[PDB]
């Protein structure tokens, strides 16, 4: 049934645009720069993210800020969330705690002064704007090059995959604080960067898909997995059951069948079936067991009671059941 | 290849009482070269084995943007255009570097430390090395497009720069593997550094056995070190440097460099037009002394190790 998602992938890697956020980005971040408060601005990483396969004209970017010198305080055991406290030109915003809602409304503020000079603002993923056809999400992070939190000591377990050499590589990379609350003036923890370094350069062999050879299908489980959620997320569009599940979930299981199965051999292209087929069992063996570890951050279960109920959970489970009983027809289905 | 494994480990126990108090000059000497030379900082180291009293340090200096002239067709050899300027003389330039740093004691050697000043470029690789850092089918292309993305230097060396590559040379010899953990487990243990640690023992030691016949003057640790690059893109698997195999892996190391030697071709591995073993380096009496010196080691057990 192999053949099925290779023409599911077939269409996915089909699936002027980019021109007109490059433009807008442009802009906005000029002016940006123009204030005393986000001078140090620009893209973090390539102007350009398409977190949903499904939807090439949803574009997300993130704009990034260094804190020269910041000190976290884990607000309250959770690990992966965290007050920022610190001649600054932040200061304008609440306490010794750099307040994330100031910081965001006055970085809302600038942006929907600069587009009205037609780009639309949606209403109060900081800042989302429609350039009628094309989405863009902006996200405001701040960057710190000091040493990564200690709750991230024991994650990113790669020693055994891409090596401990390259372990230690990465971590001397800065790390990133993003506003979310609860508590409201709370920073979390981001890595988004170092995944894309990950997925770009997935194998344990340095030439890993660059010939015949070694042709192996790590991203396409990852695409597949993405897709299928997003179908069932959209089949369900209407309804709930699938408003608490992101594709920040699919891609933290599918790192860690990555810590589980690291030779490449495991992940020969033409074995794009069972692979496939092992990381769907993964995903749903977390959501029964309602454990999902954070990849960086191994104590923050990202499916908590707390967080998803098990309804959701059961739901799913049930609705990925079916579609690997049936040859996943939500593939064809939208 | 148990008589080699017996020399590494002696060249292992050699190798700390003294890094201590050439940090601490070394440190303090980039104080006052930042008084006047001021985004000057440290590169980065023993480039003779035999001799750990010995080092080797270098300090960049980051000239923002820069135009390159090719010096005669030498595709290693530059003038930089854009005080010592007359083109940049390396003269003046090094008589200022050397002026402060023997005040502040109180190119350039001070426990032997040579200092060695080098310009910093972050701009693109000059076109001479288009062909050169030939990894792709060892360390991949990702690696290659990667490692030219760093700066590259020049150094002082008929008022000319020459191109600089010690720094991918130190990256690449530490992550030299094929795979990401080579060299990690058990199960992946390579011997290349093992190979070019012998190579260079070897010759070190040839060069102290001839140094009254001046034959082997123009042979360095770097053309052995350029010998063994070309071995490792010949052999790109790991499986062809299984610790098991260092006799047979240092016999096809050996060889090669005499290979090169005999037909007096031996391509600096970043500029591949730029032949380190030409007949206006090297002259050919010297080429096959060192090649009936080598031959000699060779058939005999290497008698230069004991
Ligand atoms: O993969 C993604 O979808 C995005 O993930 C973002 O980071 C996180 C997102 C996250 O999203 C969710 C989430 C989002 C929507 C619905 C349910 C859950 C939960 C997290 O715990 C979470 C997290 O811990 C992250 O670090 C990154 O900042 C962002 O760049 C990336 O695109
Ligand atoms: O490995 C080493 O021993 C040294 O290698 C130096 O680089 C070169 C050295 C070189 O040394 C020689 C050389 C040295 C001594 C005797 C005969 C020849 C010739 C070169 O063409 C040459 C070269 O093209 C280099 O790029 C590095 O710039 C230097 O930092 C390093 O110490
Ligand atoms: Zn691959
Ligand atoms: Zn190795």
Redesign the pocket.
């Known amino acids: 049934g192999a053949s099925k998602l290779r023409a599911v992938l077939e269409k996915l890697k089909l699936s002027t645009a980019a021109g007109m956020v490059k433009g807008v980005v442009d802009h906005l971040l000029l002016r940006l720069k123009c204030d005393s408060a986000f001078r140090g601005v620009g893209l973090l990483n390539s102007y350009y993210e398409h977190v949903k396969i499904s939807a090439p004209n949803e574009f997300d970017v993130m704009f990034k800020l260094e804190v020269p010198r910041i000190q976290l305080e884990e607000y309250s055991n959770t690990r992966a969330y965290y007050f920022v406290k610190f001649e600054n030109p932040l200061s304008q915003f609440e306490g010794e705690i750099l307040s994330a809602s100031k910081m965001l409304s006055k970085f809302r503020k600038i942006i929907k002064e600069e587009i009205n000079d037609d780009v639309i603002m949606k209403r109060k993923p900081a800042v989302t704007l429609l350039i009628e056809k094309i989405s863009v999400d902006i996200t405001l992070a701040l960057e710190s090059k000091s040493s990564w939190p200690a709750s991230t000591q024991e994650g990113l377990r790669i020693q055994n995959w891409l090596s401990a050499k390259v372990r230690k590589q990465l971590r001397l990379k800065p790390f990133y604080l993003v506003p979310k609350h609860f508590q409201e003036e709370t920073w979390r923890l981001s890595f988004s960067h170092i995944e894309k370094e990950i997925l770009n350069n ?2 344990k062999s340095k030439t ?2 660059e010939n015949k050879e070694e042709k ?1 299908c ?1 991203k396409d489980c990852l695409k597949l997995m993405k897709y299928l959620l997003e179908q069932l997320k959209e089949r369900f569009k209407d309804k709930k059951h699938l408003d608490k599940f992101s594709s920040y979930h699919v891609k933290t299981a599918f790192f860690h069948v990555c810590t589980q199965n690291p030779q ?1 051999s495991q992940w020969d292209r033409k074995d794009l079936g069972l692979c496939f087929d092992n990381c769907v069992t993964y995903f749903l063996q977390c959501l029964r067991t309602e454990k999902l570890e954070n990849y960086f951050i191994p104590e923050f279960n990202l499916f908590s009671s707390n967080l998803i109920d098990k309804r959701s959970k059961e739901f799913l489970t049930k609705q990925i059941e079916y579609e690997r009983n049936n040859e996943f027809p939500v593939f064809d289905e939208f």
């Open positions: 997935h194998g890993c898909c192996c790590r490449d």
